[PDB]
């Protein structure tokens, strides 16, 4: 560095960068209408009463969940497939895959919008789990996500047909291990020649510290409302921050890359099917 956003676009265009790893958080889904935790006003920090929560993280904590699983299953009902749609930031990542640049997309989101936008499962690491499947909390029987959908849509807590235990969708709660696919980080992060970080506060580990695992010559490009994490206090010479709305930062990168019309056509065709 010091690099600019235009410098990074030129490394991509010169094919100096061919293997992009991406890390994303809830801020890429707020334009789709899904509240995050930390945004002023709309974030869960500011809307505890709506979900009946003592604080926002309780919604992903097992002791609170077993005491009262209802706040969690309200969110599950909102977030179950079919309700929210991917926005331009998702279709940008889809285009990055279609253009041969995506080594892997690590996400902390549980809205499933990366898959809905058409990125193959093999390119995705849903690090904090998924509503596509569920597990009995007592006997550990696995279930497809559709098997509990009716109960979820009716506000009934899903129960196991074998032991009557609560059936919990496979979303990683505080203190639980991330999925085995998360281990791909061991070979993905040394191999990355670019790291893109979008829409996250970098406040949850071990996901957050992945920003540290790329080689010191790799640029890290943050597109976020604010500067965050290992980035904001362990700065490196090739880090680039594009602060502002996430979609505006992505639009500005897409235009420097030469991809605007193609992105617009992709979005039209994808969102119009449903």
């Amino acid at each position: 560095g010091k690099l600019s956003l235009q410098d990074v676009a030129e490394l991509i265009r010169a094919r100096a960068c061919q293997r992009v790893v991406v890390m994303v958080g809830a801020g890429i889904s707020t334009p789709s209408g899904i509240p995050d935790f930390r945004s002023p006003g709309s974030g869960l920090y500011s809307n505890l009463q709506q979900y009946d929560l003592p604080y926002p993280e309780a919604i992903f904590e097992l002791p609170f969940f077993f005491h009262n699983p209802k706040p969690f299953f309200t969110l599950a009902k909102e977030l179950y497939p079919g309700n929210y749609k991917p926005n331009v930031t998702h279709y940008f990542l889809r285009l990055l895959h279609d253009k041969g640049l995506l080594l892997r997309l690590y996400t902390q989101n549980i809205d499933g919008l990366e898959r809905v936008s058409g990125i193959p499962a093999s390119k995705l690491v849903e690090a904090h789990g998924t509503f596509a499947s569920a597990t009995c909390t007592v006997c550990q029987r696995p279930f497809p996500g559709e098997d509990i959908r009716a109960d979820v849509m009716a506000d009934r807590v899903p129960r196991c047909p074998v032991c009557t235990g609560v059936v919990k969708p496979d979303i990683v709660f505080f203190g639980e291990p991330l999925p085995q696919r998360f281990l791909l980080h061991v070979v993905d992060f040394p191999m990355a020649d670019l790291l893109l970080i979008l829409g996250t506060s970098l406040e949850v580990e071990p996901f957050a510290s992945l920003t540290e695992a790329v080689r010191s010559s790799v640029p890290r490009l943050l597109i976020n409302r604010d500067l965050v994490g290992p980035l904001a206090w362990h700065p490196r010479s090739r880090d680039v921050a594009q602060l502002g709305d996430v979609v505006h930062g992505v639009e500005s990168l897409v235009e420097l890359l030469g991809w605007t019309e193609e992105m617009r056509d992709l979005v039209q065709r994808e969102t119009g099917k449903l």
Binding site: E57, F174, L178, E205, P206
Partner: peptide, 6 residues
Amino acid sequence: SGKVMR
């Protein structure tokens, strides 16, 4: 792992 704050 596991998942933890901060």
